[PDB]
């Protein structure tokens, strides 16, 4: 019995690509989707395969360290019995010198490049051939696959469609930008494989990383970490300072292809520059390429305050933010979390997600991975205290948007992240999320004299069992009477402020004459504003308070008997409150019923800081009963200070 001579192996690129929805990717290499049969044809030289004498065994391996235990290596006989869910090969057609086979892969096989080998034994003597290579991808058409989507129209949109829209602008002005995902363009798949092959998990344990690629949760997670630079292997370098001269402007890009190519072409070095939508767009491209159903989503925020300043000048809040959602089951979580999963590749690990959009709507923030981050992107919590009252100067999570299935229209998916405001479902979610509460008010607890230095306090009360780590900005500005804020006269900022369960703190800011003296207004008024930020759950506390800097009191002493029409002497004094000297000091005293003339006494010498100043005036009561003496004090730096004194006569 002559040994079979394999002439050639035909990969049936055409029939395979068509059937696996990978036609564009079947350049000259075979690409297929897992859990679905595919075809190949052996051409023999001489006699054909005779099942009765020939034994053919197939071998597949993927990655730098394949093993059967890890599912990255498989061996399987060419036979008639087909075990569903396994690697198998069976004959389906046999002609003169051709043998057509059908191969199937598990629906949870690791995706990646595979080398296919064939062992052909005729009784005693045997031979081995490398038939070729194929690439194996996730399969949204296969019901047993974790990324299965039951709607064909949605598989066209979220996997096969190479152009779409990315939403920008603002809630009020929703702007769309066209984008060429180009997931099937020449070279792109190879680049995506490289991207996996350079991720830190592959460096740490190659064989394990290749095996874990059976999971779209794992692959998604890895893609979310590799899109931003961080460790120079990453794809894009972010920049928001509006200065992109040594690179490409984030607003300029119209697709993912050039970015991916540039990255690879420079030895896997960051591409400049990106912003959120660009990170999201690339991720979407990579994920679609590998066959995980994905869409780019945009969320809008808005504003009308100390909050604004705090942001102007490490998570923060933009006019809009973009990320991706990807479709898959979650066998790693409690049942019922299959579906759309948010992944945020915009800059515990550099990765972010996947987290079920559903766990975010429900406030179930322990669900892996990174629920709080995504929750904080669509929920903020702003409260004022005037002395507690909800503040709406800040609104997060508006008009969440993504492209419509098979139409150039926008779909609003806000409902998928957030129950209606006021709804009882919304309240249950806030409750699951953040397990009376915490408050903040400006204290002074003292007199504040024009001229002095003194402290004000951000007084913070934590009446929950929870410990909070917060940022606190506490600052003061002069405030005129018409309410306009003048220049700042004291600031304090704590990046780390710790509040133990059921405790309180009075955080001080010193207010200094030197800083306020000259920036003061006609009012003698200073506004203290505090902002307490708790970044995890995205909660904000605002406390405001105006303060009145009082003028010194004019001491007025009457000396003598109050008897009807007897003589009396008035002693009038003021203690300089300034740490500097008063010049051109003059008191003015009058009062019908006590004196008939207006007494004005000049002060020759400058009144030194902290020093008192006395003058006296003889008075002549004339009628029984109450008379008020009235006094004005004038000077170069302290003006129109007043006082009075009741006097009763007998």
């Amino acid at each position: 019995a002559e040994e079979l001579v394999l002439e050639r192996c035909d990969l049936e690129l055409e029939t395979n690509g068509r059937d696996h929805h990978t036609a564009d990717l079947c350049r000259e290499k075979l690409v297929v989707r897992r859990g679905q049969p595919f075809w190949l044809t052996l051409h023999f030289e001489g006699r054909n395969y005779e099942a009765s004498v020939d034994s053919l065994t197939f071998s597949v391996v993927t990655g730098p360290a394949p093993s059967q235990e890890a599912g990255t290596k498989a061996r399987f006989p060419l036979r008639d019995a087909v075990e569903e869910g396994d690697w198998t090969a069976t004959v389906v057609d046999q002609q003169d010198c051709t043998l057509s086979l059908q191969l199937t892969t598990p629906a949870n096989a690791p995706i990646g490049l595979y080398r296919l080998s064939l062992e052909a034994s005729t009784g005693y003597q045997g031979s081995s051939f490398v038939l070729g290579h194929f690439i194996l991808l996730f399969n949204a058409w296969c019901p047993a696959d974790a990324v299965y989507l039951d709607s064909e129209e949605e598989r066209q949109e979220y996997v096969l469609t190479q152009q779409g829209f990315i939403y920008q602008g603002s809630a009020k002005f929703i702007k769309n930008i066209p984008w060429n995902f180009g997931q099937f363009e020449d070279g792109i798949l190879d680049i995506c494989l490289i991207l996996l092959d350079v991720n830190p998990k592959f460096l740490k344990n190659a064989g394990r990383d290749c095996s874990r690629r059976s999971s779209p949760v794992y692959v998604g997670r890895v893609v979310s970490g590799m899109v931003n630079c961080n460790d120079d292997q990453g794809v894009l370098l972010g920049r928001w300072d509006n200065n992109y001269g040594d690179g490409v402007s984030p607003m300029s890009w119209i697709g993912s292809v050039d970015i991916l190519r540039r990255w690879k072409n420079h030895g896997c070095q960051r591409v400049k520059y990106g912003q959120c939508w660009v990170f999201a767009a690339v991720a979407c491209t990579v994920l679609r390429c590998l066959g995980i159903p994905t869409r780019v989503v945009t969320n809008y925020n808005s504003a009308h305050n100390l909050l604004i300043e705090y942001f102007r000048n490490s998570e923060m809040i933009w006019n809009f933010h973009c990320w991706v959602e990807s479709w898959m089951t979650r066998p790693d979580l409690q049942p019922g979390y299959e579906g759309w999963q948010a992944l945020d590749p915009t800059p515990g690990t550099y990765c972010c997600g996947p987290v079920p959009v559903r766990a975010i709507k429900e406030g179930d923030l322990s669900t892996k991975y990174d629920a709080p981050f995504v929750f904080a992107e669509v929920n903020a919590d702003v409260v004022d205290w005037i002395q507690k009252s909800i503040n709406r100067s800040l609104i997060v999570g508006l008009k969440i948007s993504t492209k419509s299935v098979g139409r150039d229209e926008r779909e609003d998916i806000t409902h998928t992240y957030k129950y209606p405001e006021g709804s009882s479902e919304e309240r249950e979610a806030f409750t699951r999320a953040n397990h009376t509460g915490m408050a903040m008010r400006i204290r002074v607890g003292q007199s504040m004299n024009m001229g002095s230095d003194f402290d004000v306090f951000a007084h913070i009360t934590n009446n929950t069992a929870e410990e909070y780590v917060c940022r606190l900005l506490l600052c003061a500005r002069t405030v005129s009477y018409n309410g306009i804020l003048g220049p700042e006269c004291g600031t304090k900022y704590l990046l780390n402020l710790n509040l133990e369960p059921f405790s309180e703190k009075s955080v001080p800011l010193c207010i200094l004459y030197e800083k306020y003296r000259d920036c003061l207004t006609e009012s003698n008024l200073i506004k203290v504003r505090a902002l307490l930020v708790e970044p995890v759950i995205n909660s904000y506390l605002l406390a405001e308070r105006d303060l009145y800097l009082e003028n010194p009191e004019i001491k007025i002493r009457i000396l003598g008997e109050p008897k009807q029409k007897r003589k009396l002497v008035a002693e009038v004094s003021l203690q300089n409150p300034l740490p500097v000297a008063l010049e051109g000091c003059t008191f003015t005293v009058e009062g019908a019923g006590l004196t008939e003339e207006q007494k004005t006494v000049e002060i020759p010498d400058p009144v030194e800081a902290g020093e008192e100043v006395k003058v006296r005036m003889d008075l002549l009561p004339l009628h029984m009963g109450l008379h008020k003496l009235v006094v004005n004090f004038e000077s170069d730096k302290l003006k129109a200070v007043k006082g009075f004194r009741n006097v009763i006569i007998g």
């Binding site: 928001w240 912003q275 942001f311 006019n319 933010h321």
Partner: peptide
């Protein structure tokens, strides 16, 4: 994107 700009800080809100």
């Amino acid at each position: 994107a700009v800080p809100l």
